[PDB]
Design a protein around this ligand. Structure first.
Ligand SMILES: OCCn1cc(Br)cn1
Ligand SMILES: OCCn1cc(Br)cn1
Ligand SMILES: OCCn1cc(Br)cn1
Ligand SMILES: OCCn1cc(Br)cn1
Ligand SMILES: OCCn1cc(Br)cn1
Ligand SMILES: OCCn1cc(Br)cn1
Ligand SMILES: OCCn1cc(Br)cn1
Lengths: 262, 300
């Protein structure tokens, strides 16, 4: 498993843990944002989910972009007219960072329905770079999830996809999920997926690796379990539509468990 | 970043990169000699190049004595200057100046050890270099060698996903890439250092192929054509062909005759076919080759 980098996985995990704390957005930047709301951010993220589906972008790219947006909005006040330009530049930067074949700038302009010019997008690109001080190699929920997946006895695709889906759902709702770190949402997502599919629970081995227990994960878990139950009703549905696709094993069609016994 | 172009004084051109020219420059207030890498964003209709975004973001968190330091980024709206720590020479030029004498074994040993430290640090921080070659390894007057040119580097996840296929200068490129495998990992950087290690001893590239197929054939002719025994899954790989000639593995003492038993051991593990068995930068630091290692200065 050199693909699983056995000589470095622990060093990497430890490092991401440190970086996730340094790249964390301000919990509650929206109260400090005069003209935008969590509702508008949900709309933006859901849109970005559809953009990534359309340009066949990695899941990582979506997660990076959301990170960039939240970090940006943590220090930069933005008018609702401009929120999408931030988002577009975030997704462009994410794509150039993470994708073998990023979509061209023009394609980003096109998906905003000429709301914005090529010149405006590339100028926000620079501004976002300036605000984040090129600090773009951010830990995401997925980077944690993929390592946690290695602890399955044995690997179950349904688990893997369901945990991806739940972690994605959390990107949508700044309240409450801005208050939990990627590593923690990923643990909650993993456990919830594992329990739903196989009945099993957070592995001792992941307690060893992460330090997290069901005790420490419980608050996030209760929030995530709620989001799962109410997801058919949520005003944003792009992620559910996305996760009906066979690519992801149709996991958005699986029934959430009514209780957790936690 | 505290930087502004007025405090720098250009000295001379020192090379070209993937974004334009590199210049040696002097900080006029501190005295510090730096290397400026200019990116002409003006010629860039697609905004800031992906190569630059990766190089800056990745080198911003790689602080290590054997990785070249990004000191600053000056982001004018017209141009982007990357301010780097300055180093006198690259390992390629030094090998050309050290011909007929050869690099002293102590200096090879020092250099390899340092390269392994820098790379271990890269790998430990989720970064693949993906273009290790002597041109991209910089040396100073104090006997330091440092990984440079992160324009092709990539932040990886665990396990790895499919990344770019066009990776690594051909002569330094690992078989798993040549055979078109869905997945490549940290092992591809070790392969490169493997080639570099041989190259430091012989003063010539170990596998100087002109085409992908010629590169493979040269590797196979030196290390033997791999089968399922030495490298399980090889015969299944996208660009494996059963028609491949089947060369015998040559005795490794004949690949690099001047090299001692410990050197041979180490090199053999760096050039193992199977990426899963290839030695890691971290493990290699403990190799007995390095028992008596010191850090002498370049001798020229
Ligand atoms: O300009 C309407 C407000 N708004 C922007 C986004 Br993106 C979502 N809502
Ligand atoms: O309503 C059309 C404009 N718009 C784009 C977003 Br994202 C939200 N609103
Ligand atoms: O809220 C943006 C998503 N995110 C947060 C961290 Br730390 C990494 N990604
Ligand atoms: O926006 C430029 C700030 N900066 C400094 C370094 Br080193 C990298 N980025
Ligand atoms: O506008 C010229 C500023 N400058 C360029 C170099 Br190289 C050093 N200083
Ligand atoms: O060989 C040129 C010297 N040098 C380049 C950089 Br980047 C740092 N130092
Ligand atoms: O690279 C593993 C060592 N080896 C290669 C052949 Br062919 C035989 N042994």
């Amino acid at each position: 498993g050199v693909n699983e980098v056995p000589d470095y996985h622990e060093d990497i995990h430890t490092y991401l843990r440190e970086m996730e704390v340094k790249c964390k957005p301000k919990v509650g930047y929206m109260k400090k944002q005069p003209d935008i709301t969590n509702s508008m951010r949900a709309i933006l993220v859901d849109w970005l989910v559809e953009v990534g589906e359309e340009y066949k972008l990695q899941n990582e790219t979506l997660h990076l972009a959301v990170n960039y947006i939240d970090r940006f909005l943590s220090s930069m006040s933005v008018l609702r007219g401009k929120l999408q330009l931030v988002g577009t530049a975030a997704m462009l930067l994410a794509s150039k960072f993470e994708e073998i074949y990023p979509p061209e700038v023009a394609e980003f302009v096109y998906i905003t329905d000429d709301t914005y010019t090529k010149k405006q997008v590339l100028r926000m690109e620079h501004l976002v770079l300036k605000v984040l001080a090129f600090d773009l190699a951010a830990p995401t929920i997925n980077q944690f999830l993929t390592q946690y997946f290695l602890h399955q006895q044995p690997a179950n695709c349904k688990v893997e996809s369901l945990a991806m889906f739940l972690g994605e759902l959390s990107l949508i709702d700044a309240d409450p999920y801005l208050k939990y770190l990627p590593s923690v949402i990923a643990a909650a997502a993993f456990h919830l997926a594992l329990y739903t599919v196989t009945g099993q629970s957070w592995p001792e081995s992941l307690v060893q690796k992460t330090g997290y227990t069901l005790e420490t994960l419980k608050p996030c878990l209760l929030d995530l379990h709620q989001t799962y139950l109410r997801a058919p009703q949520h005003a944003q549905q792009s992620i559910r539509e996305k996760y009906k696709n066979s690519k992801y094993h149709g996991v958005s069609l699986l029934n959430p468990p009514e209780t957790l016994n936690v | 970043g505290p930087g502004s172009m007025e405090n720098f004084q250009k000295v001379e051109k020192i090379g070209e990169g993937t974004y334009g020219v590199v210049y040696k420059a002097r900080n006029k207030l501190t005295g510090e000699v730096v290397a400026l890498k200019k990116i002409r964003l003006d010629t860039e209709t697609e905004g800031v190049p992906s190569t630059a975004i990766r190089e800056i973001s990745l080198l911003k968190e790689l602080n290590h004595p054997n990785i070249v330091k990004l000191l600053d980024v000056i982001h004018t709206e017209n141009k982007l200057y990357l301010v780097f720590e300055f180093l006198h020479q690259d390992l390629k030029k030094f090998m050309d100046a050290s011909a007929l004498t050869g690099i002293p074994l102590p200096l090879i040993k020092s250099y390899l050890f340092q390269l392994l430290q820098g790379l271990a640090f890269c790998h430990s921080h989720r970064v693949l270099h993906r273009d290790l070659k002597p041109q991209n390894l910089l040396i100073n007057t104090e006997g330091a060698i440092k990984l440079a040119d992160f324009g092709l580097a990539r932040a990886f996840g665990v396990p790895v996903r499919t990344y770019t296929h066009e990776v690594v200068t051909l002569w330094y490129r690992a078989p798993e890439i040549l055979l078109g495998c869905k997945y490549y990992s940290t092992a591809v950087d070790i392969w490169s250092l493997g080639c570099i290690f041989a190259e430091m001893v012989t003063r010539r590239a170990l596998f100087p192929g002109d085409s992908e197929i010629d590169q493979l054939f040269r590797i196979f002719r030196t290390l033997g054509t791999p089968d399922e025994v030495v490298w399980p899954g090889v015969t299944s790989m996208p660009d494996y062909k059963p028609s491949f000639p089947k060369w015998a593995r040559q005795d490794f003492s004949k690949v690099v005759p001047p090299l001692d038993e410990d050197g041979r051991s180490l090199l053999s593990q760096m050039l193992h076919y199977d990426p899963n068995k290839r030695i890691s930068a971290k493990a290699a630091l403990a190799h007995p080759f390095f028992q008596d290692v010191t850090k002498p200065v370049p001798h020229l």
